[PDB]
Structure formats: C-alpha cells, structure tokens
Assembly symmetry: D2
Homo-oligomer: 308 residues x 4
Amino acid sequence: SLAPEDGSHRPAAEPTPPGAQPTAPGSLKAPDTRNEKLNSLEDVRKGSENYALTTNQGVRIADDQNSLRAGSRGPTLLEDFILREKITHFDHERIPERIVHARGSAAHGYFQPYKSLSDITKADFLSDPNKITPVFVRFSTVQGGAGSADTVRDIRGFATKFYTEEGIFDLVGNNTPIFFIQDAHKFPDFVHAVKPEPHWAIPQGQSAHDTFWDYVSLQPETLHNVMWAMSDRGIPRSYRTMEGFGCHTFRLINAEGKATFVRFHWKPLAGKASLVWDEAQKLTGRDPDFHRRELWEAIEAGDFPEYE
Amino acid sequence: ISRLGGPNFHEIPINRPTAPYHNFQRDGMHRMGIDTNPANYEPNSINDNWPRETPPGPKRGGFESYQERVEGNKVRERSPSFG
Amino acid sequence: SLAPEDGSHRPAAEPTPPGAQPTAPGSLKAPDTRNEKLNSLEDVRKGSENYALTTNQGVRIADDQNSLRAGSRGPTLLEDFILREKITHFDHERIPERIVHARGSAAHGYFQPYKSLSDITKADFLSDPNKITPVFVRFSTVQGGAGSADTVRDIRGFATKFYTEEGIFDLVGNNTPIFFIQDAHKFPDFVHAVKPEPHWAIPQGQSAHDTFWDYVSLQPETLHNVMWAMSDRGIPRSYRTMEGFGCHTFRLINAEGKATFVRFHWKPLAGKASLVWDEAQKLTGRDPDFHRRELWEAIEAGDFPEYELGFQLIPEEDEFKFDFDLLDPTKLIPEELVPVQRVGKMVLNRNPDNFFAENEQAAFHPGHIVPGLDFTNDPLLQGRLFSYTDTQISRLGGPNFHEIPINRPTAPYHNFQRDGMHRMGIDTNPANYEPNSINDNWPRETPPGPKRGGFESYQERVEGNKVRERSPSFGEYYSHPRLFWLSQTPFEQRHIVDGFSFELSKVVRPYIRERVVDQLAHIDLTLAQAVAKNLGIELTDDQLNITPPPDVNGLKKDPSLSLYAIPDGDVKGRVVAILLNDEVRSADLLAILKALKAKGVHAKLLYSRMGEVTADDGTVLPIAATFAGAPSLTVDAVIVPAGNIADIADNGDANYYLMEAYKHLKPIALAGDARKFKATIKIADQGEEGIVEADSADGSFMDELLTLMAAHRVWSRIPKIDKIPA
Amino acid sequence: SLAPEDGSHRPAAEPTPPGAQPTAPGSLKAPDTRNEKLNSLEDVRKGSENYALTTNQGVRIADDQNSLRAGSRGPTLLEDFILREKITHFDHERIPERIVHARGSAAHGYFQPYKSLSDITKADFLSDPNKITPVFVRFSTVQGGAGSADTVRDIRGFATKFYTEEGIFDLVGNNTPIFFIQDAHKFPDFVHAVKPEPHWAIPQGQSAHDTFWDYVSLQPETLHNVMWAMSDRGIPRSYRTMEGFGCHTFRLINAEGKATFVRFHWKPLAGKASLVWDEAQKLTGRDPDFHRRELWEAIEAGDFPEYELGFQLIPEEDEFKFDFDLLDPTKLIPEELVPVQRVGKMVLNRNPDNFFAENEQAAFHPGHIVPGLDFTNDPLLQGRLFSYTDTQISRLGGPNFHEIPINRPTAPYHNFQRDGMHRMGIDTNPANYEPNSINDNWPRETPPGPKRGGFESYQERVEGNKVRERSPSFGEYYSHPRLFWLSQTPFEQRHIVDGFSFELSKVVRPYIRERVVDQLAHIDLTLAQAVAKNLGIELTDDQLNITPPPDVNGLKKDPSLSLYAIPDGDVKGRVVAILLNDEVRSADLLAILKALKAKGVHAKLLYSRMGEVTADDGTVLPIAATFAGAPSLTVDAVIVPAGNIADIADNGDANYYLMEAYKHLKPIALAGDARKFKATIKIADQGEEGIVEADSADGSFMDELLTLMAAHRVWSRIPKIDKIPA
Ligand code: HDE
Ligand code: HDE
Ligand code: HDD
Ligand SMILES: [S]
Ligand SMILES: [S]
Ligand SMILES: [S]
C-alpha cells in the first residue's frame, strides 16, 4: 500500500481554511452538501476505492506498467489492445475550448427568492420564498484561452444555470452593465480585434495591442465598456467581490400577460473589491490560477460566495 | 472515433459493460462518467493506488497474454504455407 | 480611407530590429524570402487589398455593420443569411488543442547537409550538399494549454518537418536528451500527473504540485529527466539558445543494407542560455508571450535562428558495449563516449502568414520517416508510433489531415485511399484498389534501392515470448541523474537545489516531499541534504549512508551536460535596456549605440512616459517604452548614460529596474553621474566585477559591457543578491 | 497483373452509346469538355499513371501486399506505419449522409439565358444571353438512405448550383410544385413520419407505412403533395424526363428597385415520362441504380440532359388577387392563370471524376442567393434558410465547407472570417476585423447598385404582432388536390387510385386507412369511392354528401398538370431491347439499327447466354446481356427480328421478357417468324395498336415503332393487362 500509515494523504471532509488540507473533489470534501441537481448526478458519479483497474470494456488489467512486446527488449505488438485503448482515450481527451470566455471557474449552489414575485412574473422559480433552485455558476475572463491567467485586465463573465421545475434558465451575464458593441453582426469583428492578432497569435489575455485600440478608435460605441475595463473593475480581487449584470433589457411576464422591462443584477454580499494593476499583472506570473484557486478554497472553507 | 464521435463510445448505453469498469482514463467528447478519484494516474499514493491491478488467476484475475514464442526477422512477407 | 495619410500603418517590408515597426505576416514582411514549400503554399494564400468584402459564397456585402430587422429598432430576422454565415463561422473557429505541447511557436526555414552521408544513409535529403530541404519547425512547452505562458519551468519541444523529395520526415524532439518514463503504456499516467489536477484544473504550466511529485517519488525512472527540468535547462532564454535532441535511438540504413544506431542532436549556433527562476516566473506575468515574440522578432530582424544537426553514431555490433541500454529512453549517451558528428545546418528565416492555419494546424509525428531511416525497439518510441497518427483524427477533424496546406508533402503522393471528411484531392484513377488491370496497376509499388526506392524495414532479429515485461537492463535509475549533477558548475548545482526546493514547497502533503528527498539521497548526498535543509527535513542515518550509484562507463562527469561549463556565448540578437533622462549626454549615447550596432545587439530606449526627450546637444530621442512597460526581465543588460540624472534618481521604477536586473545577474553599465545609481544596488566605491563604470561611455566601456554580455550572466554576483530587497 | 495487350481495359475518350464501353470518370471520358468551374478544379484533380504508390506523406511503398511482422507467421508489429495509415484512412472514410435527399446523382454543365432579363432582375447571370454560367446539379430522392434504390415512389429533388460572377446561387427545387407542409416548424414531424419508423427502421424508400398515413390523415394540408406522390409523377422514367420547380414564391429585384414575385420552373427538353408502379417497384430490385446509371450513360452518350428555366411572374400589386395565398407552399400557381415565361437553357454535359468528393460533399442551400434575387415570407422557405447552413457543420465537418473544392465559388471571396476545422485558405490580411486602419479597411463593403453591387434586402413592409400563428388564408386544403385530380387523363387517374390503394393496403391499423379515405371524400367522390372499393371500405351517407371544394379561380382543370395530356415526347436517348436468335436475319437488323440510329435511339442486343452469335450473313454480334440480366424494365420497347425463331420460341425468359414489356405498356415489334410470340401475349391475327408486325423490319415497320415510342406507353392496352399472368 502506497498511502502513508498516518492517513495524511486524505483531506478532512469538514470545512477547513485555505492551505490547511489538500483540496479535493466536492463530493469527497463535502459529502453531505446536497441539492436536487447534485443528487440527480449520482447516476454518473464514479468512485474508485477497492475497485479493480480495468479497460473501458470491464476487463481486469494485470500489468499497467508495460506494453506487450516480443521479448522484454522487443517490438510492441499490434495485438496489445490494453495499451491501444489507454493511448487512444488519451489521444482524444481534448475538445474545442469556448470561442470566448474559454478561461473560467465554476461551482454548484442554490438560489431562493425573498418573496413571491407572482405580481410581476409567472416564472415558477420566483413564485415562493420556499422554492429552492439548484444552480451551477461559471465565472470567466473573455479573451484568453482555457490555459490563460486569471488576474488579467479583462471583462469577466458570470453565468448562472438555474435548474427550475419548469426548465433550465441560464442567466448569462458579465461584471459590467454594458457591452462594447451595439449589434451582434459586429461581434466577430470586435472579438477578433481584442483576441491575439492573427499573424503571430500575440498577446494572450490582454487588450493592450494595436488591433483592439484600432477598432475602439474607429467605433466610439465601444468607449463606455472600454471605460469600465480600464478601471479597476477590469481586475477584480475575487469572483466573490465583483458585481454581475444581465447586460440586456429582458421582460418579465405575469399571469395576466402584462410585460415589464427588466435588467438583472447580482450584488456580491462580500462587497466590491479589485486589485491594482501592477499587483494583478505580477499575479498572472506568480499564480495564474489565483481566482480559480480562491473560489475553490473559499467554498472548502465555508466562505460560500453569496450574491443577491 | 469518427463513427461514434470519440473515445467515450463505451458509455453509449448499449455499449456499456454490465461488469464494473474503473480506470484512470479521463475526458474526451461526450464524457458521461464523473470521476471522483483524487488520482487520475498510477502509481499514486493520494488514493492508495486505487483502482488497482489484479494478478492473473483462475477466476476474476487480470488479463495476461499467453507467452507464445516469437522468432524471426521484421519482415513484410506472406508465409509460404499460405500459398 | 481610414489609414493615416503618411502610411505609418504599414510595416517596412525589410529587416528591422525589434520594436522598430509593427510585426506583420511573413509574406508581407519578407516577400523576397522563398523556398520550395513556401512557393507551393501560394495556391492557398488569400490577399485582401482592393477586394470587395463578401460572404464565403462570393456575394458582396453592402452593410457589414448591422443585422437585418423589421424596423431599425425591430427584431432580427431569420432570413439574414449574411449575419448567420458570419456568426456560424465565428461559432466554430476553435479546434481541439494538442494533448501535450499545446503551447508552441513556429517558423519556416531550410536545411542543407555539409556533405553527402551516402556511406551511412540512403536518405535523399542527406545525399548532396547542394540539396536544400524546406522545413517548418515548431517549438513548444509540454504541460500548459495553447493560451499558457512561455517562460514556465517545463521541458521544451523542438519539432522539425523536413519536406524531402522522398517524403515528409518529422524529427520530433525535446530540449533534453531523455524522457521521464521508459514504456509508452505509462505516458497517460505521467502526463495526467504533471497536468493540472482533475478536480479543480490547477496548476497551469507547472509541475510544482502534489500529483507530479507523487508520481516521481513512486517511479524513480523519472529522476533523470526531473534533474534536467529542475536545472536552468527548464527555463531557456530563447528557443534560439537551447539544445534539441531526438530522444531515441533510431537507425540509419545505407544502400548496402547496413544499419547504424543514431541519436539526433540540434546545436544552437547562438549558444546555450537560460533565465533564472525568479526572472522566468515573473516574466510569465509581465509577458506570457516572450518566447513566441522573441522568435518572431529575431526572424523579422534577420537574426535567423540557426541550428546544426548532429548524429551520435553507434555500430550495430556495439549495442551492448555500455553500462546502460541504448534502447532505454531515460539514459543519455555521454558525448565523451560517443561524439556528435556534425551533419548540416538549418536556418529559420520566415514567419508564417496565419498562426492558426500554419502553426495550430501543423501535424508532426516521429513515425513519419523516409527510406534511409528506421526505428528501434525503444519501448517509448514504439508506442509513440501509435499516438501521433491517432490523435489527428479528433484534433484535425479526420484522416485527410495531410491535405491541410502546411502538412502537404512537396514530394509526389498517389495511392488508393479515398474519401474521409474534408476530402480535397479529386482522384481520377479508374481504380481505387490494387492489384488492378483497369488502370494497368498504377500507382505502382517500387522495389527498395539506393535512391528513389520503396520503403523496406531493416530485417532485425526478433526473439522471445509475448510479454508485458520491463527489460532488466532498464532497471537502473540513479547513475545518470548523478552524472548530470556532477557535470554542472557550482552555480548550476545551486539552481537545481533551488528548483527542487521551490517545487517541493508547493507540495501540500509533507510525506511526498520526504519521499522525494529519499530519492535524492540515492543520487547524491550533497544535493539531498541541501534540498532537505530548505524543506526543514533531516536525513536519517540510513539515508546518510546510501552508497552513491556507480559512474557511467568510467565517467565522473561530462562537461557537455552543462549549460555554462564551456563558454559558447554569442551576443548577436541580444537586447540592452537604455535608461533615458530628460537631458541625456549625446556623446555617451552615440558611443553606446555605435558599439551595440557593430555587434548586432539591439537597444530599447526607456523613460518614465512615452513620446520623446531631447539630448544636451538638441538630438531628439524617441521613447520605446516606460520603465514599468518594458521591465528588465525582457533584456540582457542595462546601460544608464550620463546627463540630467536628478530627473530619474528618485523614480521608484528606474531604481527598481537596476535592482531587478542586478538580482537576475545581468551586466549593468553606468556612465558619469549615472554612477549615482551605485547606491541603490549597494555597489562599493572601488566597484565590483559585473558592473561597468566610467566618466563617459567609451574608450573601453562598451568593450567591457559586451564581454560581460558574451558570458551571459554574472554568476560571481550570486552571493551578493540575497541582501537586496527586489 | 496488368492491362490486356489489346488496350480493351480503357474506354474510348469519345461519346459512346450505353453499354459500348465501361464507364469512366468525366475528365478521362470527355477531356475536352470544359467550363470555368471544371477548370478551377484542376488544382485538386489527382492522376495516377506512371506514379509510384506512396503513403499520404509521400513515402514510396515497396510491399503493398503484407503487414510487417516478426517472422512470416508472426504477430503484426505496432511500428508498421504504412499499414496503420492505410487502415486509418479506410476506417474513417464515411461522413454523415444528408438528413433528407441522401440518395442523389449529379453532373456538371452550363446555363445561359435566352435574352437579358435586366427589366425584371439585376442578377448578373441573367443579364446577357452570351454569359455562360457553370452549374453542378444533383437529382435525388427524399426519404431513403444514400444506399437506397432509385426508382422508388417518392418526391425527387432537383438542386442546381450556379457559379455566377457575383456569387454562388443555389436553386434547390423538387419535381412537384408544392410541398406537403406549410410551416418549417413541422418539417421534423413530417420527415420523421415518412422516414423508417423509429423502433425497427422499416421501411426504406417508401411512404407505404402507418406513420406517414397517420400524419397525412391528421394534417390535411399535406393532401396536395400526396396527390402528386401517388400519381405517376412519383415514379419518373429518368431525371431527364421530369419537371423541376423552386417550390416557393421568391422575388426578383431590378436595378430601379422594383420587386416582382417569381416561381421557378425547369422544363425537361426530353419531355415528361414516368414508369408504372409494378415496373418501378420491380426495377428497385433488378437495378436499384437505374436513374444514377441512366443519367451517367446519357451524358457519356452525348444525350446531354437539357432543361429550360422558366419563371411565373406576379407583380407586387397582384399579391392578393388569387383565391389562394401566394406564400402558401402547399398551393401551386396554375399556368392557365400565370404562364411560365421561358428564361434560358441548362445543359448537363460532364459527369464528375469522383462521386464522393464532388457529389457526396456538395452542399446546396436556398439561402445562397445573389443581388437581383430575394426571399418572401413563405413560412416554409423562411425556416429552410436556417437549416441548410446549420446541417453542414456535422455533415461536412465544420464551417469551412465552402473550401471543399466542388463548393468553392468561381467569383472572388474575401472577408474577415478565420480558422475553423481544416482551414485551407491562408489569409495574409494584417486585419481580421473591420473597421480597420491597418489594412486601410480592405476588403471593403460595396454599395448596392445596378451591377457588381453589395447585397441589400428589399425593404418589404412588416406589420403585425409576434405570434406563432398560421395565416387564416392558408387554411384551405382540398381545392388544389381536386384541381390536380381533374387535370389528369383517365389512365393517370386510375394510377393515382392504384397508388393510394396499394399504399393504404400496407397500413396495418385499419382506422388510419378509413381516415384517409374520409379525406379523399373532401377532394373528389369518384376518387374516394375507387380507393374505398379497393380497401373494402364503404362510404357513409354523410361522406357521400360532402360538397366538393371550389374551383381554383374558375378553373375546372389545367392540362399542364398532367404528364401526358399534351404530347411532348422525344425519343432521342431512349433504348430498345433487341432479342437475338442464333441466326438473325441480318437484313432485319440492318434496317432496325439504321432507323434507331437516325432518331438517336439506343439498342441493347440480348440473348440466352453471353458471348457472340453469328447472323445469316456471317456478321458476328456481341451480346450485351442475357434476357434475365437486362429485363424489359430497363428499356422503352422491344424488337424481335426474324431468323432462327425456333432457337428462342420455347425459352421461358424470352417469352416472359415480352409478357413483362406488354404488361408495362411498352411498344413491341415482331418481324417475320417472330410473330409466333403474338401467342404469348394473346394478340389477335388482325393485330393490336401497340404491337408492330410485318414480314420484315423495314421503313414502314420502324416508323410505326418509333411513332409508338414518341408516345412513351400504349395506354389503350390497359384493359387488356389485368388478365396477363406476369
Ligand atoms: C452581457 C453578457 C454577455 C453579452 C452581452 C455577451 N456575452 Fe457571450 N458568448 C457567445 C456569443 C456572444 C454573442 C453573439 C454576443 C453578442 C452578439 C455576446 N456573446 C455578448 C458564444 C460564442 O455563443 C459563447 C461562447 C461559448 C458559448 O457557449 O457561448 C459565449 C460565451 C459567454 C459566456 C460564458 C458562459 C460559460 O460558458 O461559462 C458569458 C458569461 C457570456 N458569453 C456573456 C455575454
Ligand atoms: C523525444 C521527443 C518526444 C518524446 C520522447 C515524446 N514527445 Fe510527444 N506527443 C504525443 C504523444 C507522445 C507519446 C505517446 C510519447 C511517449 C509514449 C511522447 N509523446 C513522448 C502526442 C500526444 O501524440 C502528440 C500531441 C500532439 C501530437 O500531434 O502528438 C505529441 C506531441 C509532441 C510534440 C509537438 C509537435 C508539435 O506539433 O509542435 C513534440 C515536439 C513532441 N511530442 C516530442 C516528444
Ligand atoms: C426546414 C427544413 C427544410 C424544409 C422545410 C425543406 N428543406 Fe430541403 N433540405 C433540408 C431542409 C429543409 C436540409 C435538412 O437542410 C437538407 C438535407 C441536408 C442538406 O444539405 O439540406 C435538405 C436538402 C434538400 C435537397 C437536396 C439538395 C442536394 O442534392 O444535396 C433538395 C432538392 C431539397 N432539400 C428540396 C426541398 C424542397 C423543394 C422543399 C420544398 C419547398 C424543401 N427542400 C423544404
Ligand atoms: S450587455
Ligand atoms: S526521449
Ligand atoms: S416547395
């Protein structure tokens, strides 16, 4: 047995402050934190302790250290299906990242209203303060790839999937109340302009380059959101300490059929807080996973991110 | 990998084993299984090396190939016995 | 017209030094550079000047600013095909990244051999010193994603696609001579261990976490490549200043059928040079694109990356002449035992036009060999042969990945394979099978021979049972790690100690650190104790008495394993920060730049804001960047000319600039009143080695600075840096 | 393993009648046939003669017969990269077939207008009678898979890609002028209902099953296109002998901005002709590739398929002037009300080289329009515009499907779209966005205007609330089916009755059959009774009293809706079977072939074995096929020359050949003693209209036979075939 005698390989399944224990998969860290969605995923969770190592077809593997070869210094044989299945699955691990917001960090939680909103909306999840709606929330940057740094200067995404009794509602918002552009037809122009430039694929995670500012200088509708990004809004301390916005006017519709225009807000109960530019930029080098880590460790500690 | 869209074709319901399957393979398109193992490699100490290899034996043992003697040069050649 | 009237939007189509012009696609930057492969890509190049904006179907668009809607404040209509085509293409821009080496930077070039190697190989590309072979080379890290940082601590890849007249040959190597594991079956285990951990996908671009060090502690075969990764080899200065290696024993096969064992080498003609860890880490923050940028800018300046191809050659009858197995890819062949024979030179002289189309889509695979080469039973190489074909079916969308333009052979290709997704070639052959009579059996098989023959494998003898078994001969883990460590200078050993100590401090479970210190004590006690001390760990009496492993074939060191033991410095294409003031002394600046120019060293003029300043004599000095904007991390040395020093003397950024460069062992030069800065870095009045100083920037002031830059960094300074708060 | 020395493996590169030579890729059969699009494909056409067989990487293969193994009876080795490339390509050949119209056959050709249409449209391809536009056309069934049969009962597709100077225009039509449903939202319900049922995936190529008739019984909007499918229009003789229609009201826009509604037509210059059901059904077993083969062989013979493009034009102010809605795609515009104006001619004159690359990968989509054309609010068309771009993402592997060679425009295309899987074009533009200054904003938008202008949508007024609601004007379902019924000849009517009767007899659930018959009672009582009688159903008193729907704008019938009521036969390209005997009277064969050749009618010489027979004068006659191997299903008429009739008089296959041809209403001619076969088909001494007979085959005999063939089938024989046991 390879684990240490004293059992110090395994993190306590109780809330612990950052750095006190190794981090762990959520169902192992907090087995008794439940909601309808988390429970419904049990059919696909797979454990490991006390099980035999197998192929994907259920065949027990005797030797997971060697390829099948003709003699112990010989060529590898085509009939080694165990090696080929293992290397095939490896070879095909990756899927395309998101076109934008490829960098992002997510957690499970729940939502509950403070009071029935039936006077203004028939949305079932807003109909009773007793209605508990599971959520899965993903926070993100915009420009950089899935392996880019967290504390860049960028807009941040804030996407919430509400698993309601009357369907999925996704509230797909950002951390500023507007966008750079007015018409969707220009989205690939704006995004190409902010992304790494096409000849050489530089710079990652940064608007600080000629094409972005070229587009901005030629499209003054951009200037409002550019102001937000150049502010310390663009460099939050934590996904816990930033605001969220729905970006658009939507409508609520009530049982009588009356429409009300609405814009959505998320107010962080831990308050608003951002880094300073020098600190953010250096932090992309010292810990490019700083926000991902901070979110995971706040939840492990019981410092649950809360938004109104 | 093209016909069924990727390396997780064993998780398409008709294809699934009824026998247990556990290993350190991860990800791929259409991934259904949510692995809770702290480890995705072996040997590991962080999960006490589970899931673990199993020696061959008379029942419920690991797969080991028959130790057939191979002898010859690397050749692209049809056996004369096939002619 | 949106372009400025003075044409300042268009970069000069001629060699210019870094920062002088905006960068540009290669065919616009350097239209006069060519080779056979670049010429053949012309059929797919797309221009843009003077053309109308269209759909992909060739319909001209009138308004590319708006969607179609019912009234100008109305709903967007489904019939807007111009919107949905444009948004559809955007929606599907991304393809899966490489499983490993996803972060990489690539350039076109050419290779030519120094003489015909026909006595040892029939490979056509090596048959004639006049035969010039286009190449495309991609350098990469291993762990991080395509949008991770360049100057991480990691292994680097060094992949070369040779477009030979007898097929594609891909030499898919790394910047170290070995690998972490012995058998390919373990590759997903090792890679999973070094990659971000699967619960939370942390950390990116780093081996400094529990699962990596768990695997290493349990798999001593890894320690040799770990030594390399923990040394300054893991943080190169530039893709231009690292070695490349082919990793495995392959074979050369001559026209007579004789097989010779070969390992492949690339020697950087710009010399070997690496960063230091604090600098490398901070640089991942200040410019995560530094190596990609440096490569592109070197080529645009005419500082073409050059590498010499070399072979270590071992006769077949010498297979068992060494203390280690030639097939064991965790073992290096010391150059003291088998010298590198020079073979030819490769020059990278053109950037791509489109990074996605040429770099992201390029597919390299070590099974892509040509007649004159062959494999061996290296069990890591054996498994690689499966992987690099397989992985392309998802990454590049199917089995016609050779028809993507960058991947196309320049040699003819004809066969009976048909269809598949993205099929470009339209085959007119009446037959799609052989043997056939309906096309007189064309295209036809070709017997092997001295030139232009079919591929036939070398008839190596195979004997033994079908086994999943590691060769006993591979069961030795410590002697190569030890040879490596003993071959390093004392400052290089110090940086290895600090690499392990820093990485193990990030491992959360203490027993994993202890287990790895135990492994170190099997390699070298001094190493092990120094790492232990940094971790607060005390070696046991048993650990103190572990017998060191034996030397490797009589060797107690091999200086070729050191970056620095043997000077191979080259200052051409290096860069100096010049720290400006509002009244620079022109005569200092003239002499600085004249000497830098004469050796091909670049400069960047830095100040506290953008714009210009004016020297004493009225010369207008344009500013490249601010002190904060272009940190010392990004340059090789700093020079401060004389003048109105009081202007920058209390500037935090300016002071810190010299502290950072000082800490990172870079040459510093101070002329006249700029000597006032000696106080910020605590330099004595009689001066110290590595700090150039004088009343004015010449006679021998630039020669001194340039001598220091040829030696790369001031290693003697290392005992003084701990004191400086930087 | 090679070609025969006589060169007989290779088809002559000259036009040759069906069966005279093996068929071949178009560029080899007809190398001098060119057009702008065919030429532009030269970059990707790949030959084979005199080339070495290689891997896809350009490595010559020595042994393409064997895997690499350890000894010649040993295991195959993983290092066999030649085996794995070849098998990997093969393992990934297939791409997803089209959701609908998966079964299709395609050819290249060209179009030109008869005169400039600039008064009604500014479309460049309709602007000049001497501007030629390349086309690629694919004909298809709808329901069955890509390996289903051709001569099923189904709607046919007729899709034309016009490669115009101002962009690709795809006219994506069918062989009937309406569709089964009104709103695109129901398309998956209808298609799922006609497709193989989901539990067991039966039946292929057939609407004759419960789910289809369940949907029709519940959605009377479908009854109009059902009437067309049940008629002989559902079983065309050839893609050369059916009409095409664009299905929707589109708009033409002229340079002055005037909009005219238009519906598109294609008139077959070879005339309108269909099979009979029993023949069609049996032919799906004897030759499931009959229409694919006939199309390919017509083009190899020079019987180029020709179609006339025609437009129904309705001025904008006449939108509401009919008693149906112009935007309802279940409604046709009778040519009695709105005549088809002839517009131009399309000729299909070359087959592809590789069916997969050019046919299977072609992507047609009706949203691919060009300036001068525009859409309408037809709610079926509206949703089609979403589907034809979306579906290519999976079928063709991503958003670069326009780079697959067959799909590329010949017109320039330049834009700021980048990347996507298997990206071919390498963009050099410094800019990938607009507005930009860095490339002076190229490529640039272009204002709309008379010619070469940007696309702008016609400024149609929209007024209404956001609703999911069917227009009340669409809620009439029976008048157009009735118009169609009343316009058919009596034998066409009988065949419609028979198609409904045959289909509904395969519906297992009897209440579905009853509900369909109730729908038929709302269209025409005579039809409804005739179907009921065949299903053993008796109409109720109420059903008997259903008031017939109103005439369509005063019309009692419109003969243009019939296949046959107005003669339009053309025999060129048709085929006759000639049943040989072992001593043919050469004088008869001489006169038969001379007359057939004068009208471009082909012949196939049949016998009871293959090889040769010798005629009375020593002429050696090669045999194309046996009586069983090329049944009368595959020909238009049968001729039996004189000679040694005893040789075949008691041959069961030869007698049956005539019985099947007789049953199927085909002309038969019998010369000399071949008149003895009159007994097998019960023709009286006096003779019968449709049986040509004389002492010998002469001028008069062949004229009579060719007159019969110009009328396609012998409809007057129908009363006589009930009794024949065939
Ligand atoms: C206001 C909040 C907001 C706005 C206004 C937009 N984004 Fe987002 N985006 C996609 C496209 C898209 C378009 C076409 C527009 C304006 C027309 C916006 N964006 C502006 C996308 C390409 O479809 C996207 C990429 C992956 C994906 O699934 O959809 C996408 C991502 C995205 C996210 C990430 C959600 C997640 O996966 O975690 C968020 C938070 C936004 N967008 C916000 C957003
Ligand atoms: C010797 C230099 C070297 C070695 C020993 C290995 N890698 Fe590499 N690698 C792939 C798999 C693979 C396996 C199975 C093994 C040992 C079993 C190695 N690696 C060790 C791959 C997953 O098939 C890979 C990912 C993308 C791809 O197409 O192949 C792959 C990448 C890779 C590159 C990247 C080439 C490029 O596109 O720039 C390089 C330089 C190596 N490997 C070197 C290498
Ligand atoms: C809203 C869905 C929809 C509806 C309402 C229609 N179509 Fe369609 N059609 C498709 C959605 C579609 C498709 C699913 O997108 C296909 C199959 C895959 C493809 O590329 O297009 C297709 C293919 C397709 C083809 C085959 C082109 C080829 O040869 O590749 C033809 C000829 C037609 N259609 C014709 C018609 C006609 C005459 C319609 C009646 C006016 C019609 N379609 C309505
Ligand atoms: S937004
Ligand atoms: S290696
Ligand atoms: S239609």
